[PDB]
């Protein structure tokens with residue numbers, strides 16, 4: 001029985017959107033800028049940043065977007081995306097993230113959003129079991145597809 | 156022989172995702188292949204001894220949502236019809252992962268063995284409650300909350 005040492009950087013990896021609520025429904029409706037499907041998050045303790053990778057449909061077309069947020073002394077984060085954003089992590093653990101975001105768009109309109117995100121955790125022992133079974137069946141490693149990275153890098 | 160196994164898999168039902176799929180015949184999982192399956196949901200029924208698979212596959216340049224029902228055998232394996240006949244076994248299973256072995260025989264008698272690793276997206280009640288309270292605190296109407304786990308309009312992996 002063992003578990004990796006808890007580190008903020010250990011939280012980095014594939015994350016998925018569960019729910020997003022908005023004070024302004026138009027922001028999360030079809031073609032809304034905040035109807036975001038998360039792919040990956042990267043936390044950097046040293047730099048005090050969080051890199052967001054997500055997908056959003058715009059003009060009937062899916063787009064991959066990257067946003068870097070920077071931490072402030074008070075602990076909140078600021079990011080530039082469809083206006084200015086100040087977001088706050090309300091709850092965070094190895095498997096979930098609950099956040100509150102305040103957005104002020106290019107017209108001075110303020111929208112507040114809430115979101116619940118979950119992390120996809122792949123444990124070492126499970127990967128080992130998969131590879132052993134795969135080698136037992138005489139399957140060459142080049143004949144294995146990584147579906148998770150495909151989902152993390154869509155088009 | 157061996158003795159019966161107490162089967163309580165019902166609680167493992169929910170959203171699941173494909174991590175890796177291996178195959179003895181690469182054609183079956185290459186792009187446009189029948190087993191290049193992106194899982195979405197699994198539902199286990201301990202009373203009927205079945206498992207419902209819900210996944211997406213791209214065929215001839217078009218995305219398809221597929222539903223397959225598998226039935227458990229006395230042997231402990233499950234059988235299901237999909238692009239031929241399939242007999243699969245759960246080699247390792249927990250609240251977070253599933254490692255399985257599947258044997259498929261297509262319409263031409265060709266045998267293909269596949270291995271797979273799937274992961275569950277677990278949403279805890281404690282975290283859901285935190286989200287709902289926060290959402291209520293900010294005066295957001297339940298109608299103004301979008302569910303991204305079970306949504307029709309989603310990005311394409313390829």
Ligand SMILES: Nc1cccc2cc3ccccc3cc12
Pocket residue numbers: 020034036052067069079081085086087099100101113114115116
């Ligand atoms: N700061 C941000 C930048 C880009 C997208 C965001 C999407 C969010 C969704 C729910 C809650 C907070 C969010 C913050 C975001």
Ligand SMILES: Nc1cccc2cc3ccccc3cc12
Pocket residue numbers: 176177190192208223225235237241243255256257269270271272
């Ligand atoms: N029963 C099934 C139906 C449809 C696709 C499957 C893809 C699989 C991939 C690896 C291991 C087992 C699998 C079973 C499958």
